Structure 1
Amino acid sequence: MQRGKVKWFNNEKGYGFIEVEGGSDVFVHFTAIQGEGFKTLEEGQEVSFEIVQGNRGPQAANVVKL
């Protein structure tokens, strides 16, 4: 588990990337976003998350807005 900030998120498409200090960007799909409310992220938002490997490569899991 670790923290990062949303790099960008296309609200219409429901995905974007988390930027990591000193690391590679991490793909994030809306289905990973925790909490209640419309599943979205905004550029700059700090998040905690886990990295998992799926068929398309690394992606975020358990994305909590801080």
Structure 2
Amino acid sequence: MLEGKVKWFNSEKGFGFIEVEGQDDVFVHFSAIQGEGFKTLEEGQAVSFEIVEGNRGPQAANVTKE
């Protein structure tokens, strides 16, 4: 699992970017967010996650709020 920080997140639209040291920023969609409750992220929130890449390029998967 990768560790990173939420760079920014549009809570209304349900998407943002995770920033991570060395690597580029990682697009995160709300459907990647684990746990219970309404799925959203806060700027600067610590997350653990993976990067999954299909034919639309890399994005965050299995994002867990730490």
Q: TM-score, normalised by structure 2?
A: 0.95
Deviation (angstroms), 1:38? 0.8
Residue segments in structure 2 that go unaligned for 5+ positions in a row: none
User: SS in structure 2 opposite 1:31?
Assistant: helix
Backbone CA RMSD of aligned residues: 0.7
Deviation (angstroms), 1:22? 1.4
Residue in 1 that maps onto 2:33? 33
Residue in 2 that maps onto 1:23? 23
Identity among equivalent positions (%) equals 83
Residue in 2 that maps onto 1:54? 54
- Paired AA for residue 40 in structure 1: T
Structure 1 residue runs of 4 or more that deviate by more than 3 Å after TM superposition = none
Q: TM-score, normalised by structure 1?
A: 0.95
